[PDB]
Design a protein around this nucleic acid. Structure first.
Lengths: 64, 85, 92, 272, 114
RNA sequence: GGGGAACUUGAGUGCAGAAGAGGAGAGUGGAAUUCCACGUGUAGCGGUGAAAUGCGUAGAGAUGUGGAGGAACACCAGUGGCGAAGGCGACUCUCUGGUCUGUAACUGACGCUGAGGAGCGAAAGCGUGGGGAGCGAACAGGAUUAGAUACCCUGGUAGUCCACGCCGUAAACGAUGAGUGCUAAGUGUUAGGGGGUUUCCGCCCCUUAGUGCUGCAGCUAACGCAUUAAGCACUCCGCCUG
């Protein structure tokens, strides 16, 4: 139920910030769903965009 | 981007702050027409943009007809300078 | 308004580092672009192997251009035998 | 650049030709022509050793630069010309120093662009580099085997080869027909695709046009007589009762390899 | 030859067992068909369990103690063989559920009821 | 109806934002399937309700490497979003279409519909040239059967893919034409805007536009629809008469 981005009041991802992307991907590398992250619907799509970009850039593994 | 729009409206300005005045509008419509036409030549198959082009040219057409019925003088003085038949 | 990221493989002598980054910045500025800021990361264990390197060198080139220089950049980057990956983003 | 003749007479019933918009001029540069008289399949002693040949339209040879030896001098290209020796079309490119040369016109070449040939040339269409500088996975044409000999291997219209990787003194390159080959890394090839890609789709309508090109008629072996071909003879139209179909000189001529099996080059071919 | 890796496929018709070295070098292998199961009985957990201890017996005489197991595919042999290993006296240090899960891969074969 | 003079709600323009698998072109990347060479490796592997054809001592399958290629973009993913419809999901960039919100600065009825006409229009299919991993009509073999030209198993050509043309059909479905106005509520959810406590979070109240689910009156032959009407009405088109 808790919505991390609107709770801490932060704007768009700024994809370089690789620290929280770990918290938002599973240890397996699977991107966590809304049912567990509790984030807002509008922000989730730009999330998976950011994770996909950094994944292509090899900051996050495709599978761990 | 948007600078040609300002150029066109400012140079076709009839009333000091007119942005309706369909003689002004049809200028922007013609600009969009030929710009999207050069885009179509480089992408033949963009049928959705083709649909947008059809919509916008139809809009320009009925605007022209309305201006014709409103006054022939303004029509003629615009069509001759814009060169379209 | 493009923020370019790219990687240069770890086994570069620090002599040739400055050469390669400097010539890339030369390409950007010569193709009409202007650098709004440069910035680096250095080492980081890659999330996965790419060719044979476990780690790599990470560099950032924050640039504002007319969107023609970066295509030439992409060509030069992919055709250089030493850079591994790179992308361009149109920052809004 | 392919056009159809509407069938007016009966000869043009099935016809296609290539309009020459890719070409930019009609008259060649006098300096680079050389004489050429057609041999018509006759050996030095006068005997005939190549059937189905001779009698075309007379043509004049234009010496092409297959070597690309001149390195470092910026080359400007201003022409695209027709050349009736090989399918491809050529470009007369003039250098900064002031001597001109002919080059196989590659696909996507236009008048006015620049040319470089050094071992550090930028990689575009028309440049030539020793293969060691060439990067993997880049289309290339006009390859050679012995360095300095000049391109031999990919020269016809629309023909191309792909580099599958460098591994040492040699290189792996995928020629046309896909039979990948091992080639020395010190050889110079021309980057790009040969620029007459539509040449295959020609539909020569008339027999007379093939004769203009200089191809004599070919008679089937079956309608020959027994003494002059292994198929000839037999009453009526006979099927060939000779197990394997055979050639005019005795060998079989369907589905069997012919290259002397001990040759040295084989060890490079077999990479495949 | 002290450490190794035991790989077992858990299919719906069979269960293979193979052991290898950390360098990916095989030592010995077994299977339901290797033991003598020919029909659908190869898919039973019992067949895979038997496979487990024959693999262990082929493993001990070369002197390997510690293992960790990779399981492939879904099947009834998932639970049988893994605990059959430690029943055979060996020590398996990790369980890895590695199966080929393509993102899209190739289009799968047609349905079974058309 | 015609003509003249108004006016701004309808319809547009400008101004500030917002969203999106909207479209076309170029390039890029990850897990796999297959094939190939290589190391290790013994005796079967594969498959179904049992089986069999197949592949294996010419060393399979398995398992650890390295290549080669072509197809689709896992979770995110949601009766979510966009598009007029077909349809559209990996990433980046180039070009480009439409929509909504708040405005009130502009024009002042410029609007709706639309026979013929024009363009799009899934999949199969056709023509030319490439490409071909997997799947797979046809076809072969093995099973089942009294028979099995099928259901099942092992292969596998055409196709499936790409570029340009052609065909113009689908249960192309919400089996509900387009536009406009009015007629109880409750409840989710998508993109917003305003306000009340703070310009913290997040609590609530209004508010447009979508997109679902229940449910009055009303309609319905019954199902059921019910502000996303199949209700109350007006224009325009198409279609029906065992």
């Amino acid at each position: 139920k808790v919505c991390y981005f609107t709770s801490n009041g932060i704007t768009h991802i700024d994809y370089k910030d690789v620290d929280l992307l770990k918290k938002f991907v599973s240890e397996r590398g699977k991107i966590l769903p809304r049912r567990v992250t509790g984030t807002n619907a509008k922000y989730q799509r730009k999330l998976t965009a950011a994770i996909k970009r950094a994944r292509q850039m090899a900051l996050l593994p495709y599978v761990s | 981007t948007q600078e040609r729009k300002n150029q066109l409206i400012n140079e076709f300005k009839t009333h000091e702050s007119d942005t309706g005045s369909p003689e002004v509008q049809i200028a922007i419509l013609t600009d969009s027409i030929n710009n999207l036409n050069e885009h179509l030549r480089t992408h033949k198959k963009d049928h959705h943009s083709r649909r947008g082009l059809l919509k916008m040219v139809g809009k320009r057409r009925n605007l022209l007809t309305y201006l014709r019925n409103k006054d022939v003088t303004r029509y003629r003085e615009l069509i001759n300078k814009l060169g379209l038949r | 308004k493009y923020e370019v990221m790219y990687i240069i493989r770890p086994n570069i002598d620090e002599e040739s580092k400055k050469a390669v980054i400097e010539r890339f910045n030369n390409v950007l500025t010569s193709n009409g672009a202007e650098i709004t800021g440069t910035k680096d990361w250095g080492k980081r264990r890659l999330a996965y192997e790419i060719n044979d390197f476990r780690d790599g060198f990470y560099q950032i080139v924050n640039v504002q251009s007319d969107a023609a220089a970066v295509q030439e950049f992409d060509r030069l980057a992919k055709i250089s035998d030493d850079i591994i990956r790179h992308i361009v983003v149109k920052e809004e | 650049a392919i056009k159809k003749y509407k069938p007016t007479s009966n000869g043009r019933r099935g016809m296609t030709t290539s309009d020459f918009a890719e070409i930019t001029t009609d008259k060649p540069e006098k300096s680079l022509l050389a004489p050429l008289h057609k041999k018509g399949g006759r050996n030095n002693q006068g005997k005939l050793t190549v059937r189905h040949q001779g009698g075309g339209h007379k043509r004049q040879y234009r010496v092409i630069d297959f070597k690309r030896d001149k390195d470092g001098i910026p080359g400007r290209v201003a022409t695209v010309e027709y050349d009736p020796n090989r399918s491809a079309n050529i470009a007369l490119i003039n250098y900064a120093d002031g001597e001109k040369r002919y080059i196989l016109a590659p696909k996507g070449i236009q008048v006015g662009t620049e040319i470089m040939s050094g071992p550090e040339a930028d990689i575009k269409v028309g440049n030539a580099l020793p293969l060691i500088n060439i990067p993997v996975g880049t289309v290339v044409h006009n390859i050679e085997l012995k360095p300095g000999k000049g391109g031999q291997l990919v020269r016809s219209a629309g023909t191309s080869a792909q580099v599958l990787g460098k591994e040492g003194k040699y290189v792996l390159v995928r020629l046309n027909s896909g039979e990948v080959r091992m080639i020395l890394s010190a050889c110079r090839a021309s980057i790009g695709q040969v620029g007459n890609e539509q040449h295959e789709l020609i539909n020569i309508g008339k027999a007379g046009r093939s004769r203009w090109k200089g191809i004599r008629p070919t008679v089937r072996g079956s309608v020959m007589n027994p003494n002059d071909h292994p198929h000839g003879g037999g009453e009526g139209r006979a099927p060939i009762g000779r197990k394997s179909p055979m050639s005019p000189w005795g060998k079989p001529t369907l589905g069997f390899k012919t290259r002397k099996k001990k040759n040295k080059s084989d060890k490079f071919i077999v990479r495949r | 030859i002290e450490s190794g890796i035991a790989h077992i496929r858990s299919t719906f018709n069979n269960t293979i067992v193979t052991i290898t070295d950390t360098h990916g070098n095989a030592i010995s292998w077994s299977s339901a068909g290797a033991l003598g199961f020919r029909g659908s009985r190869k898919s039973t957990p019992f067949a895979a369990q038997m496979a487990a201890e024959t693999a262990a017996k082929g493993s001990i005489e070369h002197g390997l103690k510690t293992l960790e197991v990779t399981v492939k595919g879904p099947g009834s042999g998932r639970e049988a063989a893994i605990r059959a290993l430690q029943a055979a006296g060996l020590e398996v240090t990790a369980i890895r559920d590695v199966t080929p899960v393509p993102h899209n891969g190739c289009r799968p074969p047609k349905r079974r009821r058309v």
